[PDB]
Design a protein around this ligand. Structure first.
Ligand SMILES: [Cl-]
Ligand SMILES: [Cl-]
Ligand SMILES: [Cl-]
Ligand SMILES: [Cl-]
Length: 185
């Protein structure tokens, strides 16, 4: 009971405990037509079609209120996550392969120029970070790892990390719940 159930669902919970199939790669990956903090088309330029279109919509919403967001890193394959994890562990003198939500193709790191497009806490103090915190849900996204929820999500606050879950994001935001709690996983 270490394997994520309904692994391909928009509401799947992938975390320290629940892992995805090592051979799971979404079959509907596309590049969302949004600005990116990096050039070219790499594996991280993709999101599942539905999450891609939602992200485009979130960015249009942001632009209407003068908020300019940049996409930093989306989909990451099992293969990639393995190397990243191994090379990150030996740097002692990051999620385990399969246990990163990025492999679902529903997750995206976002930042802004006001934060040097970096994925750091300071992004929370920017007008863009704050807008994202309170507006992510309007497009189907949630801040996957909120402030004092590390006990439940297993990760410290990540203001830059959004997860597409669809219509339930509205309720998750209002009720101040984590995806774990909302899905009883
Ligand atoms: Cl691909
Ligand atoms: Cl949220
Ligand atoms: Cl919190
Ligand atoms: Cl925290």
């Amino acid at each position: 009971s270490n394997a994520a159930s309904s692994f391909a669902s928009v509401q799947a919970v992938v975390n320290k405990e629940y892992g995805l199939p090592e051979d799971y790669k979404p079959e509907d990956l596309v590049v969302p037509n949004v600005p990116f903090s990096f050039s070219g088309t790499l594996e991280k330029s993709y999101l599942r079609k539905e999450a891609a279109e939602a992200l485009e919509r979130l960015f249009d919403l942001a632009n209407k209120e003068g908020i300019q967001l940049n996409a930093v890193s989306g989909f990451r394959s099992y293969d990639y996550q393995k190397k990243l994890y191994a090379n990150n562990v030996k740097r002692k003198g990051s999620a385990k392969p399969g246990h990163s939500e990025h492999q679902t193709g529903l997750t995206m790191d976002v930042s802004s120029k006001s934060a040097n497009n970096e994925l750091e806490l300071t992004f929370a103090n920017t007008k863009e970070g704050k807008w994202l915190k309170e507006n992510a849900h309007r497009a189907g996204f949630i801040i996957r790892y909120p402030k004092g929820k590390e006990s439940i999500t297993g990760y410290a606050y990540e203001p830059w990390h959004i997860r597409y879950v669809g219509d339930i994001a509205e309720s998750i935001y209002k009720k101040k719940l984590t995806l774990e709690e909302y899905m009883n996983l």
